[PDB]
């Protein structure tokens, strides 16, 4: 009943791990327009796990994985006595189709994410912000299908260390002010692994 | 318990809509063979929704959708005092693989759908006919997989307005008589939409 | 009993949506008088919804609407180490008759909204402020009548996309200091729509 | 439950007041026909409230009002030993459409209000008479619509002091005798006010 | 409790009556396009009630009315052995804004009412069709407001016999075939009258 | 409740069948190293079902299938008085990614499957061995996703007779001794079929 859940985890090698990395996010200057800096983030397992050996290719010796949750932290670098305050948006985007302008298109004067059903407000020179959600894997390029939220039926993927797929996350728009400012963005994956495979000589 | 279902629909922007279109179906003449007119129908969301603007590309401002049900109506154009009565078949075909003869192959003398497990009889100069079922999306060309019927686990698809996928429906065979006859075929989609996204300047 | 409420929403096409826009608010300088900046806001549906096509004139394909609630956010642009603090008032004004001085009349030395029954204090160089209330439509110019608060009996209006009416909201007075300061004002409409009408070719 | 009614009256500034004015009514002489004197009364708030100052335009510092009830008193000026007794009618007329003859049309020989569903008999040289009812505001000239009796849903109107609307009341017909007689007509409004607004320098 | 409802109907003169009229509807010919005949109906009380006398201007001696329900009947003139069958739509349109093409615009090739939330299918050479609903009065031209369905709070209107207002009803689209066909359209008003006023000499 | 399961199987044509085939497995000689013979097995439906006719292409007249279980039997050909005993491993591998050395890479000196979570020991000159598990279909080459074990939600596939997909099974490593030995490997599919389609002339 609950020892049947124990023997499912023992037989199949089910483990639960937490992986974390950081990046830096630069919002440029804007003189007298208060435009929006629009970009996005996706999640690949290759950024969180380094390269292994010739014998054991992954430093995590598991054959399969699925991502349960992502936490995305926005950590500010500027104090609260900053001279300009801005109010932007963050959205989870599950199909990998963002509003991010390509090279040639300018930065918009209006918030492109303000009417979305899952937008939160990021107060964004000097305050903390975090989103927490289930990401979706980017499998098909033609149809772009994704599963509903269901922990028992979520698809498994091979951990291949270099050929890992993208997982679709977060779009954001940030108000630009008189001075360029900084964020340290921390990503935290909550991963469930399966099928322990350590090769030994 | 049931207000948790309300906050799931409010947070994610879940709406339920009904979309309808009509086409005309021509069955040609056959002299002294009583052959069968075999064709099929699939469903794309591009036929039901027109083109939008440059700003909002879809007239329905939702990011994702899944089709719950199709109703296909066969509406006759001829009265019941017609001189020849025919008896054909309709079948739901979920993988998109029909028995429809290509250009060069003739129309068969026998009903190709008469032994199928889900065939209904269409009495087909002058009577109404309708089918009601869950369609399946045409994702993979190599494997052709599709889900079982489960409303909670059915896959979500991006609404892309021009690049929309096919959904697999109905095959039919109609007995041809001494005179060519007409049907108006009405399709009705029952669509569930998700993630309201209206761009405003 | 509660599935009778479901069939009322399904038959009539009742949906509930949230629309948001932003503007910028400038309070000018005042030397050695501490006068008040008095202005007001009304709400039209044309500012929140862009223009549609020739076929479907509104990007929201609904025939009727009524506004349930407005949220008005005052988001500051200056930090809390600002050298002058001011204390003004916000009031909901339902008939559309404000105390705003016309071109030629000066800005008053006294708070014109300080004795109103529904005034809140806005601490107004560097703090957040929000009002939440039912707005009233501006129908008659001669009598200026409006309904009491009643969700079941509230009047319906056609969504006409360009000829939309005004809805009467908020008056405010802000204390002016030694330096001109900024607010980003965010408006959020909670709209109930009725009678889905999508034209398809 | 009943302290929720207290905080509704306190937050919105709900007060209930009684306003009274008097006029004189002259019925002229008629020799040997016993004709009827037909006239009517409507109610404007400008007759009951005098002019205010430049600062506070109304002597009642409230922004909105609605009239709950009118009492109309007919107070006689002649004693009961008067030589001729007459028997007329009073009617409430809610749309503002009376049978009162214009300049050029004579006074009728018959009672124009005798068959109305809400007529009372006024014994009318020397007796008291009173009517008590809900009046209706005269909003539209083209359609002339009015609400049913409902205290919770009755419309609110701005108190504008000079531009106030008419409220539709009473029609009456009085039998004329050998001598002209007098009435002092007293009107009493039962008004509910809302949104206290006193301007102070 | 229920004799209080009796004395409300007796004091105010409440009666309930049924008024009926007929018109003829012509759908023209169309060669080889199967276009749609789009028109609409509104309801005025002047068509249902003839002119009265100089003394009593209306043949119904009541001062006020409100329309509770309309029934609209489509009665066919052709038998069921007709050579072409068509399938159109009927919709209730409450604001008086129809899709009916003006003089100069042609008849559309597509059904303009097929996606509306309250459309019914009219099988339309030879079959009966009926709609039953609450109509809304056309009061304002600028705002076009209308009440929700509520029998206790529905607005009253003066019965003026010649200056009566429009009440907003039904839009319809009918498929045109090889031959022009006929319908007799029967309208039935369910009217509630108030304030009996018969003038007698 | 359980006759609803009967009408689901009757309407859709659900049948359950067992298909079996045999192959021969050769382990070569190794002099004085005791190396491992590493290979794998996948399952295609084309090996279990022969070719049909031009009319009915599959000898099983069903349109869809899904594989529930595989049994893989290792049947020995040598008696238990064999002079060398070996101890290898079998593993289920669900993504189709095996450790099998390509042409050019030698046979390893160590067991590559000894640390896997689902390995069983095959005592492997002269003893019986069997594995029993749910196989996974090889759909995507880029992502390699597969479902968790769930009988109600398992994907359906078209039975196409020649274009059938691979299903991912078993990897094994066998200890090589002084003499080459033999196994007869028996595979048993437990297949659930759907949508009976027999064409008749």
C19 in contact with chain B, both atoms CB, cutoff 8 A: yes
Q: Which residue of F has its CA nearest to A151?
A: F148
Measure the CA–CA gap between E34 and B184, rounded to whole angstroms.
Answer: 11
Would you call C75 and A87 a contact, using CB atoms and an 8 Å cutoff?
yes
Q: CA of F64, closest CA in chain A: separation in Å?
A: 22
Measure the CA–CA gap between A148 and B152, rounded to whole angstroms.
Answer: 7
**D27 Cβ contact partners less than 8 Å away, ≥ 6 residues apart:** D37, D124, D174, D176, D180, D181, D182, D183
Decide: F40 and F169 in contact? Cβ < 8 Å.
yes
Residues A149-175, buried b or exposed e (16+ Cβ, 10 A)?
A: eeeebbebbbbbbeebbbbbbbbbbbb
Residues in chain A closer than 8 A to F142 (CB atoms): 139, 165
Nearest to E115 among C64, C155, C196 (CB): C196
Measure the CA–CA gap between E54 and F198, rounded to whole angstroms.
Answer: 84
Would you call B147 and F155 a contact, using CB atoms and an 8 Å cutoff?
yes
- Count the neighbouring beta carbons within 10 Å of the beta carbon of residue D115: 15
Sign of the C-alpha dihedral computed for residues F157, F161, F167 and F169 taken in this order: positive
Measure the CA–CA gap between D64 and D57, rounded to whole angstroms.
Answer: 13
Q: Which residue of F has its CA nearest to B141?
A: F139
Q: CA of B132, closest CA in chain C: separation in Å?
A: 19
- 3-state DSSP helix/strand/coil percent for chain A, to nearest 5? 5, 45, 50
Cα(first)–Cα(last) distance of chain E, in Å? 39
Residues in chain B closer than 8 A to F196 (CB atoms): 115-117
Residue C4 CA from chain centroid, whole number: 33
Q: CA of F117, closest CA in chain A: separation in Å?
A: 6
Decide: D42 and D166 in contact? Cβ < 8 Å.
yes
CA-based R_g, chain E, Å: 20
Alpha helices in D24-143 (DSSP H): 45-48
Would you call A110 and B200 a contact, using CB atoms and an 8 Å cutoff?
yes
- Identify which of B14, E108, B56, E89 has the alpha carbon closest to the alpha carbon of residue C61: B56
**A70 Cβ contact partners less than 8 Å away, ≥ 6 residues apart:** A43, A131, A132, A133, A134, A135, A167, A169, A187, A188, A189, A190
- Identify which of A95, C59, F163 has the alpha carbon closest to the alpha carbon of residue B165: A95
Nearest to F157 among B112, B115, B144 (CB): B144
Q: CA of B74, closest CA in chain F: separation in Å?
A: 22
Decide: E178 and E84 in contact? Cβ < 8 Å.
yes
Would you call D11 and C117 a contact, using CB atoms and an 8 Å cutoff?
yes
- Chains B+C touching (3+ CB pairs under 8 Å): yes
Q: CA of E71, closest CA in chain B: separation in Å?
A: 26
- Identify the three-state secondary structure at position C147: coil
Chain B touching partners, 3 or more CB pairs below 8 A: A, C, E, F
Token readout for B135 is 């369609």
Resolved by = cryo-EM
D155 in contact with chain C, both atoms CB, cutoff 8 A: yes
Tokens 């209080």, located at residue: E4
F13 in contact with chain A, both atoms CB, cutoff 8 A: no
Chain E touching partners, 3 or more CB pairs below 8 A: B, C, D
**D20 Cβ contact partners less than 8 Å away, ≥ 6 residues apart:** D48, D186, D187, D188, D189
Q: CA of C40, closest CA in chain E: separation in Å?
A: 22
Token readout for B61 is 């401002």
Token readout for B21 is 């279109």
Residues in chain B closer than 8 A to A114 (CB atoms): 200
Token readout for A162 is 């270099």
Supply the DSSP string of F31-71, one letter for each residue: SSS--EEEEEEEEEHHHHS----SSSSSSS-EEEEEEEEEE
Measure the CA–CA gap between B184 and B72, rounded to whole angstroms.
Answer: 10
**A117 Cβ contact partners less than 8 Å away, ≥ 6 residues apart:** B11, B12, B13, B194, B195, B196, B197, C18
Q: Which residue of C has its CA nearest to E95?
A: C158
Would you call B184 and E84 a contact, using CB atoms and an 8 Å cutoff?
no
Measure the CA–CA gap between A96 and A138, rounded to whole angstroms.
Answer: 7
Measure the CA–CA gap between E161 and D92, rounded to whole angstroms.
Answer: 21
**F32 Cβ contact partners less than 8 Å away, ≥ 6 residues apart:** none
Supply the DSSP string of A4-66, one letter for each residue: HHHHHHHHHT-EEEEEEEEEEEEE---SSS--EEEEEEEEEHHHHS----SSSSSSS-EEEEE
- Identify the three-state secondary structure at position D5: helix
Residues in chain D closer than 8 A to C97 (CB atoms): 63, 158, 160
Q: CA of F15, closest CA in chain B: separation in Å?
A: 12
Would you call A195 and F116 a contact, using CB atoms and an 8 Å cutoff?
yes
């Amino acid at each position: 009943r609950f020892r049947a859940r124990y023997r499912w985890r023992r037989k199949n090698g089910i483990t639960n791990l937490r992986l974390t990395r950081q990046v830096e996010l630069w919002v440029p200057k804007d003189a007298a327009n208060a435009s929006f800096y629009v970009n996005h983030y996706t999640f690949d397992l290759d950024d969180f796990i380094p390269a292994g050996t010739q014998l054991n290719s992954s430093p995590l010796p598991f054959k399969y994985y699925r991502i349960r949750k992502v936490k995305v932290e926005f950590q500010p670098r500027l104090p609260i006595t900053s001279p300009f305050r801005g109010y932007g948006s963050t959205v989870p985007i599950l199909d990998g189709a963002f509003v991010t302008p390509a090279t040639g298109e300018s930065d918009p004067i209006w918030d492109p994410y303000i009417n979305f059903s899952g937008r939160h407000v990021i107060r964004t020179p000097a305050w903390y912000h975090k989103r927490y959600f289930t990401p979706k894997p980017l499998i098909d390029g033609n149809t772009g299908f994704f599963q509903p939220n269901n922990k028992q039926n979520a698809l498994w993927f091979p951990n291949k260390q270099g050929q890992n797929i993208q997982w679709s996350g977060l779009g954001f728009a940030m108000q630009k002010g008189n001075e360029a400012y900084n964020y340290q963005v921390r990503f935290t994956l909550y991963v469930q692994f399966r099928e322990f495979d350590l090769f030994n000589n």
